[PDB]
Chain A
Amino acid sequence: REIVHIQAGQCGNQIGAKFWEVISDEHGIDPTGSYHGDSDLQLERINVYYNEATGNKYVPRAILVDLEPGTMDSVRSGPFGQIFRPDNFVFGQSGAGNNWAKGHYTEGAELVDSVLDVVRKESESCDCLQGFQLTHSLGGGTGSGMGTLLISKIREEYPDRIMNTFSVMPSPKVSDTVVEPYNATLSVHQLVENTDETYCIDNEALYDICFRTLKLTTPTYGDLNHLVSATMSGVTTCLRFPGQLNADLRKLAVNMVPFPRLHFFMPGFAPLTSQYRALTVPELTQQMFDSKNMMAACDPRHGRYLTVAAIFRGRMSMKEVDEQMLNVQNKNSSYFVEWIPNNVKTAVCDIPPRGLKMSATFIGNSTAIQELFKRISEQFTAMFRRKAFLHWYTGEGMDEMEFTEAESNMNDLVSEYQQYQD
């Protein structure tokens, strides 16, 4: 069951590149695409993310999209840049100027058909296509605007496939332009309709973790992307290695999404150290559920968990893992909705991530995620009430009505979460 990966825009490609660098190491694939591993568990499910070519080369099933050549030239010149299929580099020249309208309606529309031809070529040779996973940010123009355009057209051609995304949420703490709330609000509505699973990665949380926890006074995007790499590897562990729980995108969605629109997840990772000490299973569990280890910048105690997916990696006592997971739920049962029995599923993988004897990845569908949408909505309204900066968008054909609707759409999403929190 193959997965087709897509990374669009600056953020999507810089994070997408680190993702392939991380999992390529975990599966024993070198920069040239040759396998040099010592465990058959590395190759048992290598097909989910890699294509097998001539000479026993493993080529990532990845499509690199952007309206500017800048970031993609960086990837092609990066460490694992040579591993990507050259034909899968689809890029324009104008750029999107951090403008959702440019990526979704003008500049992006001109290039989207080229991307769909590569997606179709990758899908045609798939024995059993699970679906797609997209990495992108919501505050820019290409990943946000054209990314959601791709999602809509991909759904039209592949309506019976799962759509998964890693979506980086903008934050004034780590901001490039003032229009990011506009772009994020327009994109969130697209994700509410056209994705089955979206990992909400908040640049605010990534910054706080680098600053407060990792002790990085001046965090860079590279430092933020290191957290996303480790998180993306953890959330996809059940897809890349043999297992029983959440082993594919659909079964994951069936376990995690009780209502179609409430499919935005809080990812968490443990440990997060600044390092040679062994971490006990009780410690992994406490940190994994600690708000300080999650990437959405939302307090789980301000809401309730609809569903939870836990993944432990490394050689450890699976009996002790079961005990610790049961202790978390039984000691804090008030934070798990009681009308979804046994809503916490736990998976264990023998192969740990690089540089760690054992780790833990947290995937939570909590109603506290509304705090993230409320935040974006407040910032959006602060400018929209004065129609500030709208000319950048009306100049591309958009009408104010479309902004009013996106605003109302997200306030509905917030109300829907608040409904199930009581």
Chain B
Amino acid sequence: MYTFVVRDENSSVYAEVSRLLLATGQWKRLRKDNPRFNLMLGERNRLPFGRLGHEPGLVQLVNYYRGADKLCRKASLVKLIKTSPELSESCTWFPESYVIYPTTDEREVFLAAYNRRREGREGNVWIAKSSAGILISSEASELLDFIDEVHVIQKYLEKPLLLEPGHRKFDIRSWVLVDHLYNIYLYREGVLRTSSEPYNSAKTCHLTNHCIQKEYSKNYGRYEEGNEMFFEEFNQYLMDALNTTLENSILLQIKHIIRSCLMCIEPAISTKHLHYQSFQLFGFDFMVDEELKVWLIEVNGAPACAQKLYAELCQGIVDVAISSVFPLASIFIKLHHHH
């Protein structure tokens, strides 16, 4: 009989994991402030990692990696990619980004590259965003004059891959689970969060966010249910249209990007020799251009799953992440690597 606590009521993923654990008859939930727990479904902000692993006779596991915010923050991700030699200043799969603080800061460096785009004829449309409202302007003055009112200005993918019929944008969400041993498991099932409005290069058709599509989009749900296209359908489209497969044209790059990011921070966040163990579910978001090239947009540390996939994914979390540490009485693709 194992024990666990719940310290994040707004978690839709682990609300299901909690429901599954209880149904096994071998897991007993405790009060959120009870220290004698085997497993903690911790809160998003200020999780007390310092208090974990100090219970004699208790193997303690938490569903978050301390220090993983380095990868799940707009400004943090940019700094980690520019400064880490593994990812290097030259990164073929990450859009050219810059960190700009409102009136270290990279304002002057952002204009230098911006000037070369103004100097020599090239697409000069950039996007400004922050972890907390986005602006897509081709003039640097409009972008900077907007941040004043921490942000990150990166190059806007002006030539994205457009699904037909529709001539519309989209992004790919991949769910990756990392267990206490730092095995990297990529969920076989992804989701394309598509835009129901045709792409106009001249903001509803540019932002593929689910909330924006459901409220601001007029043709919401016309092509696919909930502006969500799963891999089986997307793979068929790639074969019928472009005479290729999802695995070859996109999935190879995604698995490459996932490994590179997680292997980069592994020394900083690994709980191999630590007095408590950590696992965490990540939400990677990718953009695909017309050349069938994959770009990393951001990583989510507290992602929500697609409605149809909650059952399969949450069951997989229990199997490989929870029951592997606390055994009771594959839907993932293991991205092998050198520990």
Contacts and interface: CB of A to CB of B under 8 A. Distances in A.
Interface size class of B (residues with CB under 8 A): 10 to 19
A333 B56 contact: no
Contacts of B33: 338
B3 interface: yes
Interface in B23-65: 30-31, 33-36, 56-58
Contacts of B35: 338, 341
B44 to A, nearest CB: 23
B31 A338 contact: yes
A326 B58 CA distance: 9
B34 to A, nearest CB: 6
Contacts of A334: 30-31, 34
B329 interface: no
A384 B96 CA distance: 88
Given A322-B57, A326-B56, A327-B57, A338 B34 contact: yes
Interface of A is mostly: helix
**Residue in B3, B31, B56 with the greatest tally of chain A CB atoms within 10 Å:** B56
Contacts, number: 25
Size band of the interface chain A makes with B: 10 to 19
Nearest to B30: A333
A334 B58 CA distance: 16
Contacts of B242: none
Interface in A327-350: 327, 329-331, 333-334, 338, 341
B1 interface: yes
Contacts of B30: 333-334
Contacts of A323: 57
Q: Tell me if B's interface is mostly helix, strand, loop or mixed.
A: loop
A338 B3 CA distance: 15
Nearest to A333: B36
A322 B56 CA distance: 9
B139 to A, nearest CB: 59
Contacts of A333: 3, 30, 34, 36
B34 A330 contact: no
Nearest to A326: B57
B57 A330 contact: yes
B56 to A, nearest CB: 6
B325 to A, nearest CB: 16
Interface string A222-263: 000000000000000000000000000000000000000000
Contacts of B56: 322, 326
23 contacts: A322-B56, A322-B57, A323-B57, A326-B56, A326-B57, A326-B58, A329-B36, A330-B3, A330-B36, A330-B57, A330-B58, A331-B1, A333-B3, A333-B30, A333-B34, A334-B30, A334-B31, A334-B34, A338-B31, A338-B33, A338-B34, A338-B35, A341-B35
Sort A-B residue pairs by CB-CB distance and give the 10 closest, nearest first. A326-B57, A333-B36, A330-B36, A338-B34, A333-B34, A326-B56, A330-B58, A331-B1, A329-B36, A323-B57
